[PDB]
Paper text:
ATP citrate lyase (ACLY) is the predominant nucleocytosolic source of acetyl-CoA and is aberrantly regulated in many diseases making it an attractive therapeutic target. Structural studies of ACLY reveal a central homotetrameric core citrate synthase homology (CSH) module flanked by acyl-CoA synthetase homology (ASH) domains, with ATP and citrate binding the ASH domain and CoA binding the ASH-CSH interface to produce acetyl-CoA and oxaloacetate products. The specific catalytic role of the CSH module and an essential D1026A residue contained within it has been a matter of debate. Here, we report biochemical and structural analysis of an ACLY-D1026A mutant demonstrating that this mutant traps a (3S)-citryl-CoA intermediate in the ASH domain in a configuration that is incompatible with the formation of acetyl-CoA, is able to convert acetyl-CoA and OAA to (3S)-citryl-CoA in the ASH domain, and can load CoA and unload acetyl-CoA in the CSH module.
Unexpectedly, we observed unaccounted for cryo-EM density against the CSH domain that could be modeled as an additional CoA molecule bound in a previously unobserved “non-canonical” conformation, with the ADP group sitting near the center of the CSH module and the thioester of CoA pointing towards the end of the CSH module and bound in a ‘hole’ that is created by the removal of Asp1026. The non-canonical CoA molecule bound to the CSH domain of the ACLY-D1026A—substrates structure sits across two subunits of the tetrameric CSH module (composed of four CSH domain subunits) such that it forms hydrophobic interactions with one CSH domain subunit and hydrogen bonds with the other CSH domain subunit, potentially locking the CSH module in a “closed” conformation that would not accommodate a translocated product from the ASH domain. In addition, a translocated product from the ASH domain would have to displace the non-canonical CoA molecule bound to the CSH domain. Interestingly, the loop containing His760 is disordered in the ACLY-D1026A—substrates structures, even though phosphate in the form of ATP was added in the ACLY-D1026A—substrates structure.
Residue numbers in the entry:
A (entry chain D): 185 to 276
B (entry chain A): 487 to 643
C (entry chain B), D (entry chain D): 827 to 1099
E (entry chain C): 827 to 1010
């Protein structure tokens, strides 16, 4: 647990649940874990994270234009967000 | 151990100090002695950066390196076995102590007059330990006709 | 007549190793001028002979010429061009006007080539990685010389950094310092887009790379030529073309004597001294 | 903000026509820098753009580069190189040393290019034949600028006059002033062999021929560029390479401060003022 | 006309504090030129006004004038005079020749005044005694700037060091750094 906490706060995790963690005389086993990391800490942890990816929420596939907007958001300090529910709508 | 032959036709010396007239007299003596090479390989002057001083080899013009430090001069010229020390009385003791840390130097000539006797005795003791021959302070030096001349010994050409 | 007979000795007060005027043919660092033109070196090869006493490879001479071309002028607003224009409008002289402009070349104006070369060479030779170099410059209160543009950024490249960079990539055998500077540029553009490698930064690092990666120089020679100011010479020779152009432009336009308007000067004299 | 709204009028105090720094790309006299490199003009084409605002033909740019190459240096004994070496040995600076050397460029040193161009152009335009020109210069107590060599003569050619003359003959469309100067040289070498066309004379007349025989200039433009000192600029830019080389040479040789020997100075002070 | 009405704001790109050309009378650092001549300051007082924006005492202005007098020339052999002569013999120009000579002024030629002032001030302000200063310069491989003459020595004084030293002794209120340098 102590070491896990050091893992939690060195890689700038904000949520880290390893359940269930099965421990037997042979050792410890991480069957499952859900983790949310603080993305803005990339400039501190890019060496430790490597090429870390952040999956979108399970559902409709991301549009190429939506991924374009996400790519635009990293171009500068501006905030550039776009999300779709039904492109067949008239209110834009 | 202190050697029997101090100077030969191949003796190379380092001159401590900026004594261009003395070095030129040395070179003129070497030339009229039909030496193959000048007897002065380098000069040491702590108050300047490393450079090259223009001297005369007969009528030809040659360059002799001047080093800020003893260490660089001895590094670049391992064939030097003599130091001619033109340091004043206030610097001669330290110059000679620093010189005797290089075993390549077997003969040191100290020109300065007025060194305190206790400092000279310390120099003598270290030279005896290291087997270094010292042509004692307050001297013009000495001359080996055909081979080598110390500083201003023998006057002009 | 005593010298001809070899009867007297007189030390020469001057030394020179770049040009031999005396003799039947002019010689540029051991190379006759006819051979200079036969071998088809241009300004770059002549500069190599006169500044480094080396027969540089053809791509090195071409790169030197390109560096002179890209630094030829940068408009009339900069300090040197401004001074040259002022002196030309004073009806003065070509040499006087160009010299008045050139005397501004130094730290704040025209010295970024030398400063960038020195900074990047020091960082590269110390063995620190680009991130360590960026951090070390940051905590020393120093901006990286040769990084940063007013308008141009990643996705909006300088386009004369691009020309020189493409040439250096295609023709240089090895560009270690350029690669190091490009890693530094990746970090700095991650901080903000316009922190790109400058023309000054690219020319400085590529000139260090040319000096120590073409076969003509040892490391000591290349370092000495950087230290004594060969890149200052590159900038000065390049920008002299633009300064002379500005002089001729002011003469052709028949611009009269300039006086700075009083409304642009803040007078803060003491009450009574 | 008032200027952006166009609410106020403020006359610009400066005019310029050679370089446009502002904007996305650097522009040399209406030509983008990328186009300058794509068209493969070198130093000569950039010089044509910056000094004359013209797109010169390729042979013109090549000839300009050749002129810069042959005037790059002429040894350390001349006045400008001497002053540059003195200033470098004073531990001074690249810009300061080069400028100290350049400030000697004028009438007696480095002005023979301009003087020869002007003299030969005046003679050619007045319509007098070469013999009349030689006689007119003789009875005015004036030596012909651009004629005369210390050692070299007919059957012992300058060999950098030869290089430039061969190039000009092969590539220029017409060389009327060069032909006139060659007739003058025939007369003067009939007087004595070493009265040949100088490098200064050849460069001056060939530059006038290039200006007024390539298609880029009208006669008035070519005359104006000769008048305002473009050939002075040619010599200054060419000899700057040699002066910078001399500065670097003195720095590399670590030459100390120079003092002129007293035995070379004649002191003729008054008895008591 | 918009500036006169105070309708627009335009920051001034230049700052100056030594001379006011505009106005009825020329002003040297807050002092009218007529007052400059009435107060009978000479080159030294004008230099004090233009370089330091101060009304210096009369002995200070006299000392500045004396310093200008003693450094006026030192013959044609030095680097700057040599370059000026070369440029003059090139038929060049007064400004060009003087400038060619002046561009040699720097470290090795003409910079000993600044170097000596800085060295002695640093030693004096560090609190070390003159013997410690001499030893510290010696083991740093540095010659003391402002010490040393080619021919002149004690009992053979420079005689323009003597003139300035006598003036400074008689007219300056306190000369601590001069006393320190004399011990050195
Ligand atoms: C001396 C001479 C130039 C006077 O010129 P002028 O046209 O009468 O006046 P100036 O050119 O100095 O200035 C004109 C105006 O610009 C103003 N001005 C001067 N310098 C200025 C500056 N830096 N910024 C803004 N305005 C300025 C003046 O106050 C004057 O204002 P006004 O229009 O309200 O009178 C003219 O008589 C002349 O050419 N004489 C020949 C002899 C000579 O050249 N003497 C040398 C003078 S030492
Ligand atoms: C000041 C300092 C340079 C004195 O140097 P020096 O070596 O004693 O004397 P110089 O460098 O002037 O030259 C020595 C000899 O050259 C001679 N000489 C000087 N100028 C000459 C010239 N143009 N032509 C020929 N001979 C010349 C001198 O007469 C002198 O002759 P000597 O050998 O018969 O005595 C030295 O003490 C020093 O470096 N001090 C450091 C402080 C400093 O730099 N002060 C600046 C001086 S204002």
């Amino acid at each position: 647990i102590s070491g896990l906490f050091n893992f939690y706060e060195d890689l700038y995790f904000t949520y880290l649940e390893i359940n269930p963690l099965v421990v037997t005389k042979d050792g410890v086993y991480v069957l499952d874990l859900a983790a949310k990391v603080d993305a803005t800490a990339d400039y501190i942890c890019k060496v430790k994270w490597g090429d870390i990816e952040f999956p979108p929420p399970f559902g409709r596939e991301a549009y190429p234009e939506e991924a374009y907007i996400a790519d635009l958001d990293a171009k500068s300090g501006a905030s550039l967000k776009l999300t779709l529910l039904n492109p067949k709508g008239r209110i834009w | 151990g202190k050697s029997t032959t101090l100077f030969s036709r191949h003796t190379k010396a380092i001159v401590w100090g900026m004594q261009t007239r003395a070095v030129q007299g040395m070179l003129d003596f070497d030339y009229v002695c039909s030496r193959d090479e000048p007897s002065v390989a380098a000069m040491v002057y702590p108050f300047t950066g490393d450079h090259k001083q223009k001297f005369y080899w007969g009528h030809k013009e040659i360059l002799i390196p001047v080093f800020k430090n003893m260490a660089d001069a001895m590094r670049k010229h391992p064939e030097v076995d003599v130091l001619i020390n033109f340091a004043s009385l206030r610097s001669a003791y330290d110059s000679t102590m620093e010189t005797m840390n290089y075993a390549q130097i077997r003969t040191i000539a100290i020109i300065a007059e007025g060194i305190p006797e206790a400092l000279t005795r310390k120099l003598i003791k270290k030279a005896d330990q290291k087997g270094v021959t010292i042509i004692g302070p307050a001297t013009v030096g000495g001359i080996k006709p055909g081979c080598f001349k110390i500083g201003n010994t023998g006057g002009m050409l | 007549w005593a010298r001809e007979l070899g009867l007297i000795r007189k030390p020469a007060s001057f030394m020179t190793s770049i040009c031999d005027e005396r003799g039947q043919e002019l010689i540029y660092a051991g190379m006759p001028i006819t051979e200079v033109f036969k071998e088809e070196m241009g300004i770059g090869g002549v500069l190599g002979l006169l500044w480094f006493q080396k027969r540089l490879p053809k791509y090195s001479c071409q790169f030197i010429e390109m560096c002179l071309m890209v630094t030829a002028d940068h408009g009339p607003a900069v300090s040197g061009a401004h001074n040259t224009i002022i002196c030309a409008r004073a009806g003065k002289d070509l040499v006087s006007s160009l010299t008045s402009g050139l005397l501004t070349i130094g730290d704040r104006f025209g010295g970024a080539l030398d400063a960038a070369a020195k900074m990047f060479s020091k960082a590269f030779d110390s063995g620190i990685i680009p991130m360590e170099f960026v951090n070390k410059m940051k905590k020393e209160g120093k901006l990286i010389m040769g990084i940063g543009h007013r308008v141009k950024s990643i996705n909006n490249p300088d386009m004369r950094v691009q020309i020189l960079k493409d040439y250096v990539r295609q023709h240089f055998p090895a560009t270690p310092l350029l690669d190091y500077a490009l890693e530094v540029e990746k970090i700095t553009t991650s901080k903000k887009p316009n922190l790109i490698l400058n023309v000054a930064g690219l020319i400085g690092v590529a000139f260090v790379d040319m000096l120590r990666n073409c076969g003509s120089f040892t490391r000591e020679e290349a370092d000495e030529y950087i230290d004594i100011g060969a890149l200052n010479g590159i900038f000065v020779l390049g920008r002299s073309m633009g300064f002379i152009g500005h002089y001729l432009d002011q003469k052709r336009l028949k611009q009269g004597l300039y006086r700075h308007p009083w409304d642009d000067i803040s007078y803060v004299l003491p009450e009574h001294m």
